[PDB]
Amino acid sequence: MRDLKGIFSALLVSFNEDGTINEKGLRQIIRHNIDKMKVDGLYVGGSTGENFMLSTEEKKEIFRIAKDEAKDQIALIAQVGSVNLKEAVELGKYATELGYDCLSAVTPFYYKFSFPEIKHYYDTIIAETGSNMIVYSMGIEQFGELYKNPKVLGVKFTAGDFYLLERLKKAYPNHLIWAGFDEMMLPAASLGVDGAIGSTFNVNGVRARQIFELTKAGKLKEALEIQHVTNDLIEGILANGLYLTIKELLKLEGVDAGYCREPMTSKATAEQVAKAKDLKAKFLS
Amino acid sequence: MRDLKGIFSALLVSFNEDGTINEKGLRQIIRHNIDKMKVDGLYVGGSTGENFMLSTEEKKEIFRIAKDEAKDQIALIAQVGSVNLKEAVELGKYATELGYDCLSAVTPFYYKFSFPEIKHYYDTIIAETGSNMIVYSMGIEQFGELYKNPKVLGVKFTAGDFYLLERLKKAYPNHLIWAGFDEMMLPAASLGVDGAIGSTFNVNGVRARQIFELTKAGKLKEALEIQHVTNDLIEGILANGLYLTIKELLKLEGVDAGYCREPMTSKATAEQVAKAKDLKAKFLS
Amino acid sequence: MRDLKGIFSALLVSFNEDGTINEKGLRQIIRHNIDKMKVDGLYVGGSTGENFMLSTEEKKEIFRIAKDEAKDQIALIAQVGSVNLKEAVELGKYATELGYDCLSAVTPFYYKFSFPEIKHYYDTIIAETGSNMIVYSIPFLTGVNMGIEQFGELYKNPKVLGVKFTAGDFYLLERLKKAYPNHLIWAGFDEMMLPAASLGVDGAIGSTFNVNGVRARQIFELTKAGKLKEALEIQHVTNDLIEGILANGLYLTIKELLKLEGVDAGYCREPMTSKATAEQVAKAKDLKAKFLS
Amino acid sequence: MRDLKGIFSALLVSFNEDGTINEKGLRQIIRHNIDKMKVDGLYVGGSTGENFMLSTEEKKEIFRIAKDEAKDQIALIAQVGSVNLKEAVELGKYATELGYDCLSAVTPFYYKFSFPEIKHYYDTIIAETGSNMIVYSIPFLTGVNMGIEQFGELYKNPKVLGVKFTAGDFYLLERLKKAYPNHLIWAGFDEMMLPAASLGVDGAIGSTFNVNGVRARQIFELTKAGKLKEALEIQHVTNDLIEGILANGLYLTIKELLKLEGVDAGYCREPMTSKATAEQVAKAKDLKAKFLS
Numbered sequence A, B: 001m002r003d004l005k006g007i008f009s010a011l012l013v014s015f016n017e018d019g020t021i022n023e024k025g026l027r028q029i030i031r032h033n034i035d036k037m038k039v040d041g042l043y044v045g046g047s048t049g050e051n052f053m054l055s056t057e058e059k060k061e062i063f064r065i066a067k068d069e070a071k072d073q074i075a076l077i078a079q080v081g082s083v084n085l086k087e088a089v090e091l092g093k094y095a096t097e098l099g100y101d102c103l104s105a106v107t108p109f110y111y112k113f114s115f116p117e118i119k120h121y122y123d124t125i126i127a128e129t130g131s132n133m134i135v136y137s138m139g140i141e142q143f144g145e146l147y148k149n150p151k152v153l154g155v156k157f158t159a160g161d162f163y164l165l166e167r168l169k170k171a172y173p174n175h176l177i178w179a180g181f182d183e184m185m186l187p188a189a190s191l192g193v194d195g196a197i198g199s200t201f202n203v204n205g206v207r208a209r210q211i212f213e214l215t216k217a218g219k220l221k222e223a224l225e226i227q228h229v230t231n232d233l234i235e236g237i238l239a240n241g242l243y244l245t246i247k248e249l250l251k252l253e254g255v256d257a258g259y260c261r262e263p264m265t266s267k268a269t270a271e272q273v274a275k276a277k278d279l280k281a282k283f284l285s
Numbered sequence C, D: 001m002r003d004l005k006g007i008f009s010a011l012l013v014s015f016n017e018d019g020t021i022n023e024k025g026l027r028q029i030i031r032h033n034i035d036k037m038k039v040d041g042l043y044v045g046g047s048t049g050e051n052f053m054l055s056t057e058e059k060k061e062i063f064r065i066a067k068d069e070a071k072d073q074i075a076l077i078a079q080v081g082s083v084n085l086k087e088a089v090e091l092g093k094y095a096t097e098l099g100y101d102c103l104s105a106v107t108p109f110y111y112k113f114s115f116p117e118i119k120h121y122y123d124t125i126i127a128e129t130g131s132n133m134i135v136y137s138i139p140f141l142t143g144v145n146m147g148i149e150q151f152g153e154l155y156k157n158p159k160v161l162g163v164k165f166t167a168g169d170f171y172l173l174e175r176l177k178k179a180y181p182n183h184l185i186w187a188g189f190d191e192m193m194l195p196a197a198s199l200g201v202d203g204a205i206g207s208t209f210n211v212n213g214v215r216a217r218q219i220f221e222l223t224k225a226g227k228l229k230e231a232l233e234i235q236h237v238t239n240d241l242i243e244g245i246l247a248n249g250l251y252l253t254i255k256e257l258l259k260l261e262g263v264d265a266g267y268c269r270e271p272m273t274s275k276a277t278a279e280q281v282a283k284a285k286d287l288k289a290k291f292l293s
């Protein structure tokens, strides 16, 4: 398959006031990432896409739109995880059918699952779809058990545990790791992660790529300067409301990024809009 | 509406080997609770029913079967909560249509929601269905905000916080509380909870009722004796695997309680079956 | 042995402005507990006594003062636990020499001690002093969570009599009484006295009994007689008081409440804030008027 | 001021079988660090020194011994924090009198101190001694989490120079360097030295540097020169060693590794298990053969 290393934006979705998908806005978000953020790929249907508040049919519509808009211009990963394994298989089969380059799946949540249940969940998605898989963050022995399946490619690493990150890269050198924390891209890159999947790349993809590339070249003081500016921006984004602020920043770039999906607050308050305007002036102008 | 105080079993669902609903087995589980466990009601579609691993259509089939089998013999509460608010509304409307006595909804999960988002979620389910609501476990000021909606009846209390339980009963005396922890029924009843919703009542409903009634009469030494035997049983159930052990115990009573739903381990190992046989001999014979 | 069941105040200590012990004030706190609060005994050197911010010599002084003032009128338990096991042994020997009825010790904290290390700590304090022991479990401050099997191992030592229980885990509490029915349990959460009494605890050790011991005894005795409605009413009033005490600052508010009774309860010890603000004082007076008048 | 940047071993202390300090052994540990580990300095009286299980007088003895043995060859930092603020002041004055270059103090623990109380604690130690201060942050043991605004308040005192950072939060670490670029940071997690060095920490204070100081300096200096591939290789070998040390028992394994070098590192202090088992000794020898040979 296609090269999956590098910078992947976790695709945000544009929603209408009524909560339905705004297709025109979603396609503008996709075009912004490919053409302006210059991402290596998109991670579709993840947490950042407000995926878990949606129906199976809405998830399928998003997978269709993103693949139709992106075509073969960039790599595409489809997050199909769920508490419902039959739904994960159904979404995995559909994304595979659409031509996604690989699948990914959050560990099943809501209930507490044992490690064997989690491994069976990943092995079943893989067996039923025929597609390769990127897991989510478990310790070194458990990653080894997951990696016994040759179709598990690696992990979207979110644990804030850089000792575990080092251990994983040492023990499983041929498996890939994508950093899942945009605000810790530098230290993750210092340990040799293969790429990053993140929500903030939808608007800060230029700096993210710079950090990643400068860090791999050993230009740590300059990379740190860019991580500092990036984190000032991320700090403002987190305080103001993560998905709504990224969408409001996209609107300032002429992208119809729309509303958030309920039960998340759907409409940005005037204060949230004002803060996004300030953040754009300070960090993205 | 119908009296909702007392003992409610959180209904377990029988599944076939392939994960589909075993309707004949589900109806036997329902009949066992009404006719033998002598419950005051059933709480359908909750955590114990393996609800969160199911499709919207499977949840509807379970709501239909339970209401058709129970008819008007007992009170019926329908848990319709989800990370998807549109799905919660759709399930709430269907359960209301079937004649369920009231709805209930877990707080939206997977994402971290603010209190205002959680209140909006409950107010929306109520507004769109016209049904009363039982919330899930937040502090005293937040319960007060939820209780501003006159259609919020009370809470299925799971927090292991008996100071908060006392505060809630004092501050909101006309709102109901159902204990959600079977192993702490006595102390909850000592503080005046109005009933209990629990998974273990599917097989230990006689002792549960005895504990509740003895405790309300102030017969605490005898209630404690029955809670001790109950908790020896619960301890064995938890160690062996909660839903599978209750199902295996039901099979020993001639109830086709079936398999669990994947991603949970679906089939009981021989060791799990042996332990259930031992538990039945010691506590339910 | 001198009976250890019932109502025990976790003794508060009066400090001067400079942090030294105010002996006169401490004796007034003790008298107030014995004579007005009608306690069965005092738990001296616990968390409520500001014990872990003090020197070994200060701890010995408080032990001497409390035994000299109380004499033989009440039961006395001495909390001597610490991260320093040699200090715990030193304090346990001294409290034993003074005539304390039993020792108690918090699980060793700061470092992440294994269960075997925790068990060796209790066995050493007992062996070196010859005194009985009450395990002091307070997971919220120590981070130490011991399960039912671990209590069993501790109870293999016949001089371990029971536990001062503060976990907010009533399942574990029930399991302790099921497994070790003859071992004692003292509830450590005053705001949850009713439900703990419903599960058969043998007494209670608490900070709010320094000012609310009358109500605390009522809740305990009414619950044991099965008078739940009456007990719950007194727990409700108690918990309005406790809610206010907690919001205003626990240590300082109980001392200010005691000062309004004529007890020189003094200042708190630094690094805790030593002096109450005007707002804290005003709130203490309002709480006294409403609940202890 | 005497430069405080670089590699600092958190000094381990040699104890006799009865728990008393083994002075000869402690001097050998110090010599080993200065002469073979080539440290820039020692952090004395920290968690690794088994400090919180000791008496004030034992702490003073370790401070005297370390300064007398090291003389002026290296930088010396004295950790004097405690739940007892009067003890921290007493120890800070004594370490200042002995000539320690700077003081350090763990956030006060056990009780849930507010931020203002924590800030008053640092300001008091500084004011009463006249010495500079390094905040010691170790949320995993204390449960105290301070955010960026709180560090700012602490840094309002110009004698607070920086922090010994152990949180497993590299976002916070980056925020500290962004906001207070001239304030110092010492990484406190030896297994995460590379990524912390990528974020510009000024040095490292760690327990494994007592035996792995050569590799630790390499990782630090290679990372600062941007030689990531080389640094990562040495971090990999280091982390195989650390993984084994952690699994076998951290304190005891480092002491056993030191004994294999001819250093009388002694026993651990009780309530920690004092003697290594035969299996722990055998594993220490295997780790030495593989990684420190």
Ligand SMILES: *[C@H](CC(O)(O)[C@@H](NC(C)=O)[C@@H](O)[C@H](O)[C@H](O)CO)C(=O)O
Residues within 6 Å of the ligand: C010, C043, C045, C046, C047, C048, C049, C079, C138, C166, C187, C188, C189, C190, C191, C205, C206, C207, C208, C242, C250
């Ligand atoms: C024991 C007394 C105590 O630990 O039980 C107190 N603990 C706490 C949590 O502070 C207890 O009385 C509380 O003060 C009270 O319930 C209010 O929360 C001792 O001091 O050693």
Ligand SMILES: *[C@H](CC(O)(O)[C@@H](NC(C)=O)[C@@H](O)[C@H](O)[C@H](O)CO)C(=O)O
Residues within 6 Å of the ligand: D010, D043, D045, D046, D047, D048, D049, D079, D138, D166, D187, D188, D189, D190, D191, D205, D206, D207, D208, D242, D250
């Ligand atoms: C400071 C040294 C330290 O706190 O940084 C040590 N801390 C811990 C978590 O034990 C550190 O060196 C570790 O020992 C090491 O990274 C292995 O986990 C001090 O002792 O005060």
Ligand SMILES: *[C@H](CC(=O)[C@@H](NC(C)=O)[C@@H](O)[C@H](O)[C@H](O)CO)C(=O)O
Residues within 6 Å of the ligand: A010, A043, A045, A046, A047, A048, A049, A079, A179, A180, A181, A182, A183, A197, A198, A199, A200, A234, A242
């Ligand atoms: C992957 C998402 C992802 O990595 C984000 N995770 C969270 C908790 O938000 C991450 O990019 C985050 O938004 C930023 O680091 C800001 O904290 C996915 O499935 O979307």
Ligand SMILES: *[C@H](CC(=O)[C@@H](NC(C)=O)[C@@H](O)[C@H](O)[C@H](O)CO)C(=O)O
Residues within 6 Å of the ligand: B010, B043, B045, B046, B047, B048, B049, B079, B179, B180, B181, B182, B183, B197, B198, B199, B200, B234, B242
């Ligand atoms: C309500 C369920 C419920 O109260 C159970 N909760 C959990 C965590 O299992 C409870 O009955 C539990 O099974 C027993 O107390 C045993 O611990 C629902 O929605 O099902």
Ligand SMILES: [Cl-]
Residues within 6 Å of the ligand: A171, A172, A173, A174, A175
């Ligand atoms: Cl590999």
Ligand SMILES: [Cl-]
Residues within 6 Å of the ligand: B171, B172, B173, B174, B175
């Ligand atoms: Cl009410």
